Design a protein around this ligand. Structure first.
Ligand SMILES: Nc1ncnc2c1ncn2[C@@H]1O[C@H](COP(=O)(O)CP(=O)(O)OP(=O)(O)O)[C@@H](O)[C@H]1O
Ligand SMILES: C[As](C)(=O)[O-]
Ligand SMILES: [Mg+2]
Ligand SMILES: [Mg+2]
Ligand SMILES: [Mg+2]
Lengths: 191, 75
């Protein structure tokens, strides 16, 4: 029934089927202080293994990425102990899609299980990046699933920002891009 | 049938090693084992399409699990 989900061949049932139930016995609403790093990494190793074995992922009409246990280890060490588990380990399975407009993405707000992170006008700490990331979470004991949305216009600078980059540095690069000063990979190497 | 790409990349070092492979038990077990051997400074990830993930450019494509293991261990 949601236009954006129909366009990317997803629905709530499919998202439910791709959700991994944690066996840690701890609510993902809790901070990292309540988790054991070794237990978390062993569980994420199993989740990564599960996603590497699911053929259905390659059949869906949208792109995806299975993040590594190494990324999870760095995230744990960076955010321990005060970050909330559901905000840290929320992208093991991450889809990526080009949206026609950000307005079609905002319809996802209707789903109680979908958290919308709208960075279409920037993040709180603006560093030039632009896009909308959403996170589906079946319940407080399942790992979230991410979907990254970008327009082609934002995707182009995001790619260049990734290739080369204070937040003010990326923020200024975005201002130059919006002013027509950065139009290619050759023009990005001069500015 | 549908294929994915298993990718190896050292964090903070541009470029990756990539192998077209079939999603399944064999690939999953290979990846889990390889990740353990390579350690935590290397990421083993699975993507649908190289053109969708510019963060891994350039892609050093290989043609076997043996070559993938060797090249990943050289990152
Ligand atoms: N300044 C920037 N320039 C380009 N892309 C950026 C960006 N900030 C964020 N992104 C994109 O948005 C994604 C989500 O960002 P964050 O969650 O804040 C960091 P991350 O995902 O932990 O980085 P990682 O890709 O090294 O894991 C990134 O993976 C990247 O693709
Ligand atoms: C059986 As094999 C070549 O994935 O290690
Ligand atoms: Mg991760
Ligand atoms: Mg991070
Ligand atoms: Mg990284």
């Amino acid at each position: 029934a949601m236009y954006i989900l129909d366009k990317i061949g997803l629905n709530i049932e499919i998202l439910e089927s791709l959700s991994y139930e944690s066996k840690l016995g701890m609510s993902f609403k809790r901070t990292l202080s309540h988790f054991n790093k070794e237990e978390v990494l062993k569980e994420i190793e199993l989740i990564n293994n599960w996603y590497f074995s699911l053929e259905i992922i390659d059949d869906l009409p949208l792109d995806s990425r299975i993040k590594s246990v190494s990324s999870a280890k760095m995230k744990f060490e960076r955010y321990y102990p005060n970050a909330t588990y559901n905000r840290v380990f929320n992208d093991i399975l991450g889809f990526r899609v080009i949206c026609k407009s950000y307005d079609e993405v905002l319809e996802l707000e209707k789903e109680d299980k979908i958290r919308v992170v709208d960075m279409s006008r920037g993040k709180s700490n603006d560093d030039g990046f632009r896009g909308i990331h959403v996170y589906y979470q079946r319940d407080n004991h399942h790992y979230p699933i991410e979907i990254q949305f970008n327009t082609y216009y934002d995707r182009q600078l995001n790619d260049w920002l990734h290739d080369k980059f204070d937040s003010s540095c990326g923020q200024l690069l975005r201002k130059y891009y919006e002013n027509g000063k950065i139009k290619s990979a050759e023009e990005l190497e001069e500015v | 049938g549908a294929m994915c790409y298993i990718i190896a990349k050292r964090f903070k070092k541009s470029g990756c090693v990539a192998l077209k492979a079939k999603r399944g038990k064999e690939l999953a077990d290979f990846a889990t084992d390889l990740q353990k051997k390579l350690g935590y400074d290397i990421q083993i990830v699975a993507i649908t399409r190289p053109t969708a993930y510019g963060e891994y450019e350039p892609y050093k494509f290989v043609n076997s699990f043996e070559e993938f293991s060797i090249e990943a261990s050289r990152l």
